[PDB]
Design a protein around this ligand. Structure first.
Ligand SMILES: CN1CCC[C@H]1C(=O)O
Ligand SMILES: CN1CCC[C@H]1C(=O)O
Ligand SMILES: CN1CCC[C@H]1C(=O)O
Ligand code: FES
Ligand code: FES
Ligand code: FES
Ligand SMILES: [Fe+3]
Ligand SMILES: [Fe+3]
Ligand SMILES: [Fe+3]
Lengths: 415, 415, 415
């Protein structure tokens, strides 16, 4: 399979020479092999991208209850996110300060205190070490609380940053709020979660995500509701919006629902509320709303889909009736974890207000089709005969946009 | 298992120092550990041996039909071999020139055109890019056809070479033709294929193949039909042929069937038509022909077995009634893929002219026994206590011959 | 799982800089990450610790019969231990001197001679090559006997050393004999063996073993019979023995059973006969003897447990009724094999004198609980946020003792 091909390919690969490769890179072409296949570049992507930027973790509604927690792995980091006694959500390194053990072993739960399973060093929900057995009179517990992790709440969506010197989150947060607040995500519940591993590099997952050049042949279910128009998927709107699209933005905004396409100065994130195809209202097989009790106050009913990406961790679709978040996490040079979360109103009842299959089938199928595509792409790229090829200017503008953001971010980090 | 032992062994291994190891190598001894166990030597074997020499791929009869194709992996290369519209068989890198994707995902099939599953760039069966959607007015498709792979047809057997500067194939092809043509391989069909992975280095598979020192204890089925006489398996005939053997060569050649032992000047290949044991006619449990409708025009009926090896990819047995090809492909430092293909006349009918079990049981068993032997050999070699030992001059002349060819080829490539 | 976390963690890890890390190490703290996670340190641990020190292999009673043998893997070494024709137990490298093959493929068995399965080079049970087929007149078999492995018999327990220059074993052997001889281990049989792989570094297995700081929360079955008192598990007795403990040592020694705590000058090994909790006599759920026919002549019946450790390979519990040996063998940087062997009197009859479940359930459970603990510890340590933490002086004195022995041994080896 791909794991073998990965080993085979790295055996004869030329040196990574990253500065030389970055120097000769042209924006209109796919990346040279080792960006997608080498452990050297993968290590740089972890150190300089995933461990330095803000990352989407989970919806805040998963931490609704007192003492609730959820855990996730980011690269080699094990993080626990908890609702503290004061109602604040905080994140910590899930590593006991005694001898290093994980403290929370389950993916989610509720606790009164964080108690290490090894020797029961006990921490308060704010990270403070409040009991350590028989450590002697010269032990200073104030030096041994859990190590915090930088955390922000983006209007009901929890973001974290593993750096001691996180970049600016506030510009993004301020920009996004008008678009997100109308979805009332703090009042959501998780209706379903799907976690899959795709056997391709995280950048291949993103390049695939940032175009619909592949969609008509590969996504029969999605194409019923999501338009193939390159302006929707891509970033050609940044230079100017078509009349048809602006007319949609205006219908939304006349109705009080922010829609207008906005792209970060540095290209890290984009928000836009795009029309669905034809008469579709939601990502379903019949095109109608999946949930009869809407999540948020979006108007009009055919307001379409709020697209939001924030590199490197997340793309999202916020519809009038429900919302979907996607989290991208690196597993190895040729493996990527994608977590899709369906959010519905907290009072929407499964079997009454929505049907689980009807709610999820379209994107379950789509993700599976994307995974197959990404994996097939990865296998060809592993050939030593692979060379960069040209992106379509009309169909892949969004791919070039992502690859530029990635290369610039890496260049800056290596400076 | 062996994968663990591989990791354990490389941890404490001395540096590879390949030039120093090559310098001190004596031809009468097995190779020092890292030749059989190290990823450093494995990488050199791929780069300098498998990616530079002509390799057996598949019988041409698998590409009998219009638009037929077959795919194979050689190291990290994914290759597709196709019968083009003009009747020519060509090979290409199975990597789309857009973003790199595999084009043909199945092991075999038929197509009208080669259509990439990702964004449907469409290629003619000669590799030319004939359609690429929405690539703009400055896109030159003539720069983006599939990359060709050097290919030859050795009398019904397809060989390929991954180098842009392939070595001479013509000397071998010219020498082999008289021996092969009488088997009419272009009129064969594949009756059966067996693919196994042996957990030993590709060179251990070859060293095992090039002797029958192990045969009497390890191959009860084979020994019924294949002689143990070292002159048969080995290369002592190169210095002079025994009277008994020459008498066999003469029976064949008086009957118009080329038999005489011939060995390449550089040792890369050897052809010889050798007698079977006793009264055996074929590789069966009862010694009689497996197929009643013969593949080719070999005479007399006890002409025996045409042995042909061509390093590094193939050994072969061509009998009067059917033929067997073996393809050796490297998987990792301690793994090798061996593909055995049974060829019979295209009009031979399974259940009438041959029985599948009767046709295949002997070599299925033999390959399994060889695999066990090679794997057991590999495990001992992984010990840091392993040191070269002496080959038997009488029983292992053919092993020394292979190891010399390998070492010389590596020396020349590193020069 | 852990294998992924291992790969993730090594990607961004700082250089190992082992001399710098060793230089700054403080004895009161857990080790810096790469000691527990890096392949570089693992390679040094194999080369300088496991391949240089004496290691426990198996009880001699497994080699009771003529021509009996047993095999084990130590790192990448494959070793065979055999009872020779003269009654001596010897060990050899299980690698044929011809081409390297394993000779003995089974874990245990009996043979007349050691016959290589490949080409049947035949060795006497003392390693001498007595037959090699068709090797020519200039073959000197005296140069090609099996390579010996240094072996000692510690009062019924077989120890080996992979170095050509083994350290002193005699000081340990002489010290241990009075304690061990009363267990009559030469008259034992193996009642049961359990082999498990724990997904943590071998040093984490040892650090866990050398404290009961974790025991009250994690070992309900064990705590019924094994005391939590830090003086029992640890090495605080080295500076002076409590009155209660000395009273126990005196009961044993008045009765002729050596008990007194003794610790090696260099800390490599320790023997002590410790009291069990409450009225317990053995490691059972009811606290009574597991076997009605005792192994050895220990007195009094509540003499408790003879604890013996010898780094890096073994800890042991010798009770009045039966004994348990534990063998620690490295598998990878984050994997360790632990083999627990229950020894009972050779005439003790399963189903009459002991019940298999009753005999083994306590330590089967305990080992499983330890494995979970070690694996959870390993996962947290893999975080790049992991930093050394302080050991409990009162509860983890034995952990510091082991870590000191390890660091000193590595320092000396690198000198
Ligand atoms: C639906 N795909 C194609 C382009 C947009 C992307 C998304 O999920 O945002
Ligand atoms: C049958 N074995 C032993 C020597 C020849 C080899 C072969 O398959 O060509
Ligand atoms: C029972 N554990 C805790 C300390 C002693 C250790 C042992 O098995 O020797
Ligand atoms: S590792 Fe957490 S209390 Fe010891
Ligand atoms: S990768 Fe083949 S058409 Fe895009
Ligand atoms: S490898 Fe043992 S006899 Fe040949
Ligand atoms: Fe898609
Ligand atoms: Fe064989
Ligand atoms: Fe324990």
């Amino acid at each position: 399979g791909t794991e073998n091909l990965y080993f085979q390919s790295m055996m004869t690969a030329n040196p990574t020479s990253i500065h030389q490769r970055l120097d000769r890179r042209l924006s209109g072409f796919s990346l040279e092999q080792p960006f997608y296949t080498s452990p050297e570049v993968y290590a740089l992507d972890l150190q300089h991208i995933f461990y330095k930027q803000w990352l989407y973790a989970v919806p805040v509604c998963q931490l609704a209850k007192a003492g609730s927690y959820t855990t996730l792995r980011v690269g080699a980091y094990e993080v626990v996110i908890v609702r503290s006694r004061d109602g604040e959500v905080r994140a910590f390194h899930n590593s006991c300060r005694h001898r290093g053990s994980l403290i929370c072993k389950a993916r989610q739960g509720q606790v009164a205190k964080l108690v290490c399973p090894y020797h029961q060093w006990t921490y308060e929900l704010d990270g403070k070490l409040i009991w350590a057995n028989d450590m002697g009179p010269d032990f200073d517990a104030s030096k041994y609380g859990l190590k915090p992790v930088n955390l922000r709440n983006l209007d009901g969506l929890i973001y974290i940053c593993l750096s001691d010197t996180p970049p600016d989150f506030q510009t993004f947060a301020q920009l996004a709020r008008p678009y997100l607040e109308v979805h009332d995500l703090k009042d959501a519940k998780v209706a379903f979660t799907s976690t899959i591993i795709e056997k391709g590099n995280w950048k291949l997952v993103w390049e695939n995500n940032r175009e619909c050049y592949h969609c008509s042949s590969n996504h029969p279910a999605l194409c019923r509701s999501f338009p193939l128009d390159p302006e929707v998927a891509g970033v050609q709107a940044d230079g100017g919006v078509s009349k048809k699209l602006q007319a949609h933005f205006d219908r939304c905004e006349a109705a009080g629902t922010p829609a207008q396409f906005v792209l970060a100065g540095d290209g890290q994130y984009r928000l836009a509320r795009m029309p669905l195809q034809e008469k579709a209202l939601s990502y379903t097989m019949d095109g109608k709303a999946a949930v009869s009790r809407h999540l948020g106050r979006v108007a009009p009913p055919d307001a379409g889909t709020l697209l939001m990406f924030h590199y490197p961790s997340t793309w999202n679709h916020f519809l009038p009736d429900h919302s979907l978040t996607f989290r991208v996490m690196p597993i190895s040079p040729t493996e990527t974890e994608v977590t899709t979360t369906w959010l519905v109103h907290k009072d929407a009842v499964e079997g009454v207000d929505y049907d689980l299959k009807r709610l999820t089938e379209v994107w379950i199928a789509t993700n599976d089709e994307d995974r197959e595509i990404v994996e097939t792409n990865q296998q060809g790229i592993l050939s030593p005969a692979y060379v960069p090829g040209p992106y379509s200017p009309g169909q892949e503008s969004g791919v070039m946009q992502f690859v530029d953001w990635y290369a610039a971010s890496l260049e800056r980090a290596l400076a």
